[PDB]
Amino acid sequence: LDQLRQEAEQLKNQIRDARKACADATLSQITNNIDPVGRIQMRTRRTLRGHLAKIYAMHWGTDSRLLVSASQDGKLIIWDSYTTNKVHAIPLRSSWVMTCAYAPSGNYVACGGLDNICSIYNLKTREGNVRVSRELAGHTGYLSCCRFLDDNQIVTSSGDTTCALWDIETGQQTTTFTGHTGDVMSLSLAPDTRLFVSGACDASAKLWDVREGMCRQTFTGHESDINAICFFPNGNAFATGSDDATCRLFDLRADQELMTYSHDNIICGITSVSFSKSGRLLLAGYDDFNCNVWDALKADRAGVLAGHDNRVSCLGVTDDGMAVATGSWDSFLKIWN
Amino acid sequence: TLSAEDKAAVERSKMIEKQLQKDKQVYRATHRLLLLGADNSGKSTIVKTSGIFETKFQVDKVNFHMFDVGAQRDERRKWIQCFNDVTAIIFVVDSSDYNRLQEALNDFKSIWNNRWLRTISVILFLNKQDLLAEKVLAGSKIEDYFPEFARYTTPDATPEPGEDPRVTRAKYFIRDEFLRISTASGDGRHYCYPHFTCSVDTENARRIFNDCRDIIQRMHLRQYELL
C-alpha cells in the first residue's frame, strides 16, 4: 500500500501542473478598466422581533415577500416582510436546530440539528395547523444544511462526513455521497438543479453530480474549515467563507481560484455569504457584529451594514433583488434596502 | 391596515405575540446543564442512533435540564459552541483505572481552555470511589503510572470514612491532579467544584443545586462592582 501513495502524489502533482498552464492573467488584469460602483447606502427598513434565543438560519421564499427563521428556543416563525406581520409559529421536538429550508412551491419547510433527523412540515393542510409529515433518519452525525431540489426530493449535509439525496415519499436514501474526511458544513444548489457544491471541515470543497451520485471535481485553497458556500447566478462560479477571514471565487471549467476578497483589518471568520441578482455585489456576515459588502469584480470594500450587537449568523438576498435580510445572535432580524 | 382583510392579519399576529410572551417566562425560569464523560466513567448509571438525550430533575421547586450527547463522532470542537449559555458543565471521571487517567486529564484540559466555554463553571465528579479502595488495599500500584505519588502526602483533608490513610492519600492525589489544571488560568470567571463520588453515591443532585446556587450568586456580584 506504500507503493500506491507515491503514484497518488504523482497524479496530484500532474493535476496541479496541468492547471498551472492556464493562469495567463488574473482577474484584476482584465477588470482594472471598469468603473466601480463607489458607495452603497443601505439602511434598515424593518425590524422583526419575537425570538427568545439566538438565530442560526433563515431562508427567503420565491414570492420575495415571505421568509422563515429558526432559533434555539425551539421555534420556527414565518414573517411577512412588507407589513411586519407573523403568519405562522411552529414549535420543534428538539430545541437544538441548526438549519431551515423553504420549498420553491412554498408548500413546505424543513429543519434539523443535533438529533440526526431532518423533518418536513406541511404548510397547506385542510386543517389550519402546520404538521410534521416526514422524518428522515439514517445520518450518524448532526445535520448542518438542507435544501429542496423540488417537492419530493431533498439533499442533506451531515456531521458524519457524508451527504445524501433522499426521497420524501418513501423516506429512504436514493444516493449516498461519500468522500469527505472532515464534516460537511454547508451546501448550495445549481439553478438547473443538476449539480451541487459542498464544503467541509477538512478545508476542501467538492462538486457532486446528483444523477450520477459520484464526485466530479475538487477545489482547495483555504487554511481553515468551511463555514458557508454560495453559488454564482450563471452556474459557472461559486464563492465560500472560512474561519480565517478569507473569501474566494472558484470557477467550474477553469478549475482554479480567482481574485480573493480579504482585508487585513479583519481577524474573525465568516459565518454566511450570499450574492446579488447580477453578481455585482458580494455580502458576507462576520463575527465582528457587522455585515460587510464588497465589489464582486474589483475586490473593493464598499458598504458596511452595522446595527447588530452580537454575532451575525445568517444572510439572504431575495429573488428579485429588492432587499436583504440578516439574522444574529441578539435574536433580531433586520431588512435592508 | 386600511382594509377589512388586512385588519384580521394584525389581529392574528397579536395572538402569536401573546403566545410568544408565555414561552419567554417559561424559558426564563429554567437552568440548562451539559453532561460530559467517557465510556469507563459510568455517567449513564448516574443518569435508533439518536443524537442527543435530555433528562429533567427538580429540587426545591427549581427545574434543571440536563443534555447528554448521544451518537456523535469523535470530534467535539464545533458543536460545543451551541452550549455557551448553560449554567454549568458536569464532568464525570472514572478514577480507578490509573492507566487511562492521562486521557481524562487531557479531555479536562481541552474542555477548560475552550474559547467558547469561557465564563462557564464546571462541576467535577470522581466516580466509583469504592472500587479504588478494593484495588489499593489488595496491592497494581500508582507509582508505575504516576511516578510523583511517592513524594505526595495528605494535606485540610477530611477523611470522613477514615478507615485507611493510604486510600485517603490516593484519593486526594487524584483530586489534586485534576485541580492543578484549574488554577493555571480562568482569571476568576469560572470555577471548579469537585466531589468524591462513589458508584451509587446518591447525593449527586444536591451537590448540583448547591454548586449552581454558588455560581449564580457569585456571578451577580461581579456585575454590580461588589467583587
Epitope: 406581520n85 405562522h88 389550519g128 395547523n129 | 382594509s3 377589512a4 382583510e5 384580521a8 395572538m15
Partner: single-chain antibody, 232 residues
Framework: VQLVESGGGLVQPGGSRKLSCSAS????????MHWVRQAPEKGLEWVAY????????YYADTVKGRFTISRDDPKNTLFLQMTSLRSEDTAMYYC??????????????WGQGTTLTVSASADIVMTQATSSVVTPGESVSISCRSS???????????LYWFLQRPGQSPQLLIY???NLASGVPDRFSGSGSGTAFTLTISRLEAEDVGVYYC?????????FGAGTKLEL
Amino acid sequence: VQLVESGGGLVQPGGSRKLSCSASGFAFSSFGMHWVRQAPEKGLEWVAYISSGSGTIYYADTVKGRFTISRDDPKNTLFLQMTSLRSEDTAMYYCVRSIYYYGSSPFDFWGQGTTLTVSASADIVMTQATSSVVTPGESVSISCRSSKSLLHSNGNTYLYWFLQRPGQSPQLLIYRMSNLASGVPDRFSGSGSGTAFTLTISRLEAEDVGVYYCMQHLEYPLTFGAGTKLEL
C-alpha cells in the same frame, strides 16, 4: 373537516332561539366565523362576524342589538342568539369558515345550514347583469357589477364567486377575482379589471348547472349580488 348544525324549527312571533353551528375535525380555534342568511326566493345576505381571538365583532346593519354571538373554544361550538323574532327573520342561515393571512383563501368551507319558519344605506351596491340563460360544450360568460372601485391601494380586488349548486350548500370558485379554489376544475377563470366583472367557463359539463353568486369583501356590509341560474 365536517360541520353539523342544530336549532331551527318554527317559532311563534316574539320568541327566543339560540342557533348554533358545531365544528369538528380541524383547528376551529384559529378561524373567524360568520353567519350568512339565504332568502328562499332571493340571494344571500350576511348577518354578523366573530374573530378567532374574540377581539373584534361586527353586526348586520338591519339587525344589531337583538342578535348575539358567542364561541366556545374548549368544545368548538359556535352560537347565534336570536330574540324577538319578526316576520323578516325567516330564511336559511349558513356558518362559513374564514382564515386571514397573506395568501389565504377565505370563505372556503361552508356548512349546510338549517331553516327557521316564522308565521304571521351608504354601502357599496353590487348587482348582476342578468338572471338566467346554454349548451354542453359551449362557452358561458356571467357579468357582475359594482358601484365603487373594488381595487384597493395594496393591489387586491375583493370579489368572489361561489356556485351554489341546485340542492347543496354554496362553495367557492374564485377568491379575489382571479384566483382558483382547491378542488375545482381548471376550467373556470375570473376576468374583471373594472367595476364590471365576469366568470368565463371554457367547457360545460352536467355538474356545472346552478346559480352563481357575487360578493364584495372591501367593507363590512358584505353586500351580495343577485344570482344568474344556468339551465341545461
